[PDB]
Amino acid sequence: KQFAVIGLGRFGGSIVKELHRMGHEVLAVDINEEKVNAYASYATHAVIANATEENELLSLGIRNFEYVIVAIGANIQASTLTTLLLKELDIPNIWVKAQNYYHHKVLEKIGADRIIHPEKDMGVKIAQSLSDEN
């Protein structure tokens, strides 16, 4: 029902723009307001928070998003700690972007419903499109 994207880089911000362009409402959170301000026009609600902190997550109300996406970047701990925190919030679905075989492997066992490798996955998606192209 609900969609929450944590981390507004090229990936996360993109998935926030699309869900908007598709007519869905999104909660878009990040730690530096520059980012939050950059998507205020696309998110049904854009907030400034540190998703690694227990309390900010409750003032976020994340407890009620069927889907949450951890699209944080070059910072692996925040990523996992965040996915770890909310994993304990009982979020039915948490998808996380990954960049490490290591990272992937921990997320895997932490209980992440879906791990994403933009580069690898986009890879298969294209080979896919090539075959389709005839």
Ligand SMILES: NC(=O)C1=CN([C@@H]2O[C@H](COP(=O)(O)OP(=O)(O)OC[C@H]3O[C@@H](n4cnc5c(N)ncnc54)[C@H](O)[C@@H]3O)[C@@H](O)[C@H]2O)C=CC1
């Ligand atoms: N998703 C991941 O865990 C990882 C990604 N990487 C790689 O790092 C590269 C850099 O990617 P970008 O998206 O451009 O990274 P980036 O540093 O530009 O953006 C990450 C975003 O998440 C935001 N954010 C929101 N809440 C945060 C919090 N509590 N702590 C930290 N950041 C928070 C940051 O402020 C920022 O906008 C990527 O291409 C990715 O492949 C490397 C390690 C982990």
